[PDB]
Amino acid sequence: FSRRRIAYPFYPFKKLGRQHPKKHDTNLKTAMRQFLGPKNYKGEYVMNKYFTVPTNHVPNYIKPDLERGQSLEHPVTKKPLQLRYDGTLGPPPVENKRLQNIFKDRLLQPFPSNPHCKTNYVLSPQLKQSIFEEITVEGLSAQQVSQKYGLKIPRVEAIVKLVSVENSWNRRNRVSSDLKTMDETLYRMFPVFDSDASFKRENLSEIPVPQKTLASRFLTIAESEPFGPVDAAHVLELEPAVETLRNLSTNTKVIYGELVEGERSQYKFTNAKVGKVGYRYGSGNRDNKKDRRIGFNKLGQMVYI
Amino acid sequence: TIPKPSDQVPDVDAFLNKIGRNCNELKDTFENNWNNLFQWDSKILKEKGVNIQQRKYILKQVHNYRNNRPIHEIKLGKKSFFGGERKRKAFTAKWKAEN
Amino acid sequence: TCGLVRIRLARFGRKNSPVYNIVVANSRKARDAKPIEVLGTYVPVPSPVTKRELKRGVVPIKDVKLDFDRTKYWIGVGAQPSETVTKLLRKAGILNDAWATSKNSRKVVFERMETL
Amino acid sequence: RKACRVRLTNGNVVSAYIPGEGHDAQEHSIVYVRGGRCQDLPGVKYHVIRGAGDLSGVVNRISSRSKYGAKK
Amino acid sequence: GKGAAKYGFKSGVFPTTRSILKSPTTKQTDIINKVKSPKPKGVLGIGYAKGVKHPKGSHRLSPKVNFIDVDNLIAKTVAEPQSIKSSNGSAQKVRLQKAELRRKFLIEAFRKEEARLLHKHEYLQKRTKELEKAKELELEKLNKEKSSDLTIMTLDKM
Amino acid sequence: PRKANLLKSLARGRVRTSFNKYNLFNLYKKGGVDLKSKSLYQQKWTAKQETRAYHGEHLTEKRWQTVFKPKLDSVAQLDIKETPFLLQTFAVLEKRLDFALFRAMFASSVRQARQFILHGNVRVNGVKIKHPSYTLKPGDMFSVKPDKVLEALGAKKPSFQEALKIDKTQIVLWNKYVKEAKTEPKEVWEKKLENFEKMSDSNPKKLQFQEFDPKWAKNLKYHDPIKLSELEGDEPKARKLINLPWQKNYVYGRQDPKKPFFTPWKPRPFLSPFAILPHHLEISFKTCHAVYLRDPVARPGQSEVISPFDVPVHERAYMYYLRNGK
RNA sequence: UUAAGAGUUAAACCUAGCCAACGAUCCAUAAUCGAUAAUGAAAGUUAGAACGAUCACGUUGACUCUGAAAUAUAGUCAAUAUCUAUAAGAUACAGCAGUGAGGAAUAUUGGACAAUGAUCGAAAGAUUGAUCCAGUUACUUAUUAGGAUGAUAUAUAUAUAUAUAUAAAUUGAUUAAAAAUAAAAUCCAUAAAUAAUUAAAAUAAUGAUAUUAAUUACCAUAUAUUUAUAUGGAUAUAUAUAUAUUUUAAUAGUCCUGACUAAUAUUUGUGCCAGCAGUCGCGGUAACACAAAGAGGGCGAGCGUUAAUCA
RNA sequence: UAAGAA
Ligand SMILES: [Mg+2]
Ligand SMILES: [Mg+2]
Ligand SMILES: [Mg+2]
Ligand SMILES: [Mg+2]
Ligand SMILES: [Mg+2]
Ligand SMILES: [Mg+2]
Ligand SMILES: [Mg+2]
Ligand SMILES: [Mg+2]
Ligand SMILES: [Mg+2]
Ligand SMILES: [Mg+2]
Ligand SMILES: [Mg+2]
Ligand SMILES: [Mg+2]
Ligand SMILES: [Mg+2]
Ligand SMILES: [Mg+2]
Ligand SMILES: [Mg+2]
Ligand SMILES: [Mg+2]
Ligand SMILES: [Mg+2]
Ligand SMILES: [Mg+2]
Ligand SMILES: [Mg+2]
Ligand SMILES: [Mg+2]
Ligand SMILES: [Mg+2]
Ligand SMILES: [Mg+2]
Ligand SMILES: [Mg+2]
Ligand SMILES: [Mg+2]
């Protein structure tokens, strides 16, 4: 069974009563107004909890279920408010007990309906500079930096590149005041990555799950045989799962052509083998088909492969 | 570079008259300048109002003159007097009967 | 060109986007018919070079893939290259200046260099 | 129910239902016949296309105009 | 296009690669010994038996395989000018350069093909005798008595 | 692509990839997707409806069905909570440049990210890319023009008329405060200190205050009332005619009226509910650069595909798109 | 006879065989296939348009010459049908355009040989309806086809929950009944245009496409490695030089909402009529199904429908 | 990598 269901709020709100013939209003609009609170002469909603950004590295994600859909607060004292019968905003008659003891995992959960979405941890500029110095100056391998700071290796390399770009931009005075204010207000919104904590440091033993293993296979053997990861790897015809981590932690003859004055291009001839080189004859044409191959040029132009 | 006018081809008018292919009517679009004949490219000629075949022929003959090759008029091939091969038998049948 | 066996270019790709197979073909078969052998590929469009890289001084690259040992075999048994293929093979070092023509005949800024 | 016998260009003579509120089909009219039976008329296994040939589209049609040969 | 799965998912075809040497050569002792071996009889026999007479106009034996002598093939296909030289003219020089290049390429191709065939035979013999050892090592390593085999019930006497 | 139409309808209540205020309320009032009392088709349809409203709404149904992958990618940890495999139903959209920009928070929406790409403001490891469908591979660095990012993340720049009216109101309130302070400084000091006591130290003003005299009220100066009718159309005039302790020599929100955002840059309103740091990108906000580390994966207890819907909704949507809605 | 086997074709002699219910002979129908297309979990099934491979034919039939190879789009004879030149004549568009017909239905009487080939030539070059481009056509597939903000308009009066009043307020409705952040307005863009250049397809030279793509929003140069500040040619101004340095948007249909099957905000007309319908079925005064308004659900430069294929 | 419905 299914009907159209206007997405009314799941929490109580005061609905319209008798309306002046010319109001022309909807209950959804009133629900939004109550959620937002009064709008300033400046076009601002100071009374709404979520109007302003946090500043203490504790994200201010929505909690419509814990707080019963009461999103209003005093902007200066931050104390909860409620809409009284007379159309004013005052203290709640009773205090909420679900808004003080909030599980620390819930504070990093952007969406109330998805427990598996959590925000990442921002790295402090000091840690990023430390990693950049370690990788570039002291020449420490990315594996041991990853282990020391508990960061996945691609993230470490990305940090190195991003810090290099930042260094260039700072040497050129391209980081304007607006950019610095934006960066620092964004940085104070998210939790800060802590190298020392065990539960805040990234797991460093992850490997992709290939299709080959995903199928469950079972072996019946004598009751006392040992059967370890290496035997399992042999059975599935794969490298053992430890060499996968080990390998993830880490000729053709060519002839360049004679250029002469006035010639606008050079020829390089790469050696190939007959029966493997060429455009095949009677190959599948997909240009009129839904999976036609689209690629991008070295200049970023969309081309048809 | 711009080559030297020769005694065989003193003026641009002489060049046009020698290459032929009814480019004699194209003497006006040039200002009779050796530099104009030997510096104008295909796009300039297209702007000036030269048709495709004429400008391609002129560029070919200008190149020949640059590399010291004769610029005598090559004539575009024509059909036989008795029509083309596919219509030759019919034409000759009608021609011999009528004469 | 002459002879029954000829090394020439067979057109592939879309309209306004030519690519070519370097092929050994019977002289009578169609240009895009299945040949005796596909010796390689040829992309006539040079690889784009950035303007800063033009300041550096790189030359745009025209890409040619080729089976050199088999191409020399086909030249040996008498196959006749076309004009464009003749140009391609002369600049690859397979053919020497004896295959040049009067029109095609100059200071060398770079020298044909073989790498591994 | 409004129907008509129609002789097709392939020579077969069929019975075709005429959909829509009102029709202007008459003897010797040129029509176009598609598949689709009229369920409550036995023997009529084809439909005439409104808005094609000499059969005009339904007059003052608002909804489903394309099914009845009506312009916007 | 699921047939392409049978060919590495490659759509379209190439012309089949021509063989530079169209018959086995003389420097290939394996094929020579194989053809020159006794011919079997019985259920897998190849030819006519001792007392059986073949059809009147037919040949009892398959045609004689004619092995290639690459030295002779080069000698006849591309022989160098027996005259010392002429060395005049311009087109004559162009033709001389072209002819020597063509000849050089053709000897190179023929001899490299010879070498590749013989090298392939050597490699295949080594591969066979390396597999024949790896397989035996594996079968024997599945013969080392495992202690856990004491838990598999046995009735060897019966 | 689809023409944006009623993307923020409160009655429909679909959640979009956007920092919009109406989108924020739609997300807030939602609750969960109600799957009870529904046939399997109705469940799958509801799931598809909601999840496609969020993930890649601007893609046509047929294009999305073409780019949909039954393959779901996950990582096994070799050193327990259940891996939410089917939150990867829409992971393939995350390698698109327009989604990468939105996850990097370089655009207020995927739609705005598309426009930023199409107008030439985006680069992928050096080369300008003008095609939103462009797909990033691991390790690719992309960047956005900093003004575009600052405008996406910043507050709207007011027009002259609106800012001038706001500043008129500023003058009136400042003068009212000055009068109240001058007449009765006792009660004003009392209220000021009481409010300082009430407020939390989170405000910077409290920290600065931690860091009676009748002379105080003598420093407060009235501000002349402005009438905009005569002042209309002349920005250099109104700029010098406004002088307040907080905003000095500029009309409200237009400190430098040649940049594309609220010029004394402050974050856009309602930014914190959507401020989510992705796990598959590294973001440098000073340079407005980012690196695409990997395709999002699911691990025990977590999925890196950011979504406002629970595992059952994505399961039902995945069932829908496996069979083309059969 | 043939280069060559064979009742292959011709001649002679013999023997009485050969095929066939695991389907002969006969009849009908059909070009065949793929590393091609569709579909499906797959086995498979379908197509054989496109790309490629093979065969056959060039109005119909037989024969002959030449040739390595031809019953050749050749020649001879005949048939059919047209033209005149009225002859032991020519032509046969299944080459490219194009016309008429048939049909539900399938386009230019286009440009260039610039590229890749092919023919002739010693070469210079000539020819090429191959080919390459363009035209027509939503036939198919892509990409774009605008983002952010946005529920009022007037008045009066180093702080900040601004507060008072007067106007108005479209359709539906009297609250979980909405249309609707939708409009309008606001901010910021880009496309197009406008100018400057301008590669690449091709080089020894040649560019049909072509009012090319791409780039720059005055032009260069001179250093840094795209963002910069400088030196010099522009630039009207006011009075060489402080200044600025093109303009600039927004355009969706079509089907459906009783169940199968997504569509709850309800109303009006008709009254077993008119009609609807893929299946069950709906319509007899209270129609969620007919015809419509409001609202709503799909897909979207398409949507529906018919014909078909696969599942 | 095999779903059914009236
Ligand atoms: Mg329903
Ligand atoms: Mg002549
Ligand atoms: Mg020749
Ligand atoms: Mg209808
Ligand atoms: Mg015989
Ligand atoms: Mg006989
Ligand atoms: Mg039979
Ligand atoms: Mg037939
Ligand atoms: Mg068939
Ligand atoms: Mg075909
Ligand atoms: Mg065809
Ligand atoms: Mg024939
Ligand atoms: Mg005909
Ligand atoms: Mg015939
Ligand atoms: Mg024709
Ligand atoms: Mg007709
Ligand atoms: Mg040509
Ligand atoms: Mg022509
Ligand atoms: Mg009303
Ligand atoms: Mg009624
Ligand atoms: Mg119905
Ligand atoms: Mg109806
Ligand atoms: Mg309506
Ligand atoms: Mg489309």
Numbering used by the authors:
A (entry chain 6): 27 to 276, 291 to 345
B (entry chain 2): 30 to 128
C (entry chain P): 2 to 106, 110 to 120
D (entry chain L): 78 to 149
E (entry chain V): 2 to 159
F (entry chain D): 2 to 80, 88 to 219, 372 to 486
What does the paper say about this structure?
Here we used cryo-electron microscopy to determine nine structures of native yeast and human mitoribosomal small subunit assembly intermediates, illuminating the mechanistic basis for how GTPases are used to control early steps of decoding centre formation, how initial rRNA folding and processing events are mediated, and how mitoribosomal proteins have active roles during assembly. Furthermore, this series of intermediates from two species with divergent mitoribosomal architecture uncovers both conserved principles and species-specific adaptations that govern the maturation of mitoribosomal small subunits in eukaryotes.
The exchange of Ccm1 for mS47 is coupled to the irreversible removal of precursor rRNA that is accompanied by conformational changes of the mito r-proteins uS5m and mS26m, and additional ordering of a flexible linker of mS45 in state 3 that is previously absent in state 2. These conformational changes signal completion of 5′ end rRNA processing through protection of the mature 5′ end of the 15S rRNA and stabilization of mS47 in state 3. Although human mS38 binding occurs in a progressive manner and is present in states B–E, yeast mS38 is not yet bound in state 3, suggesting that mS38 binding and final rearrangements to the decoding site are initiated upon dissociation of Rsm22. A C-terminal helical peptide segment of uS10m initially prevents the binding of mS46, the final mito r-protein to bind to the head domain.
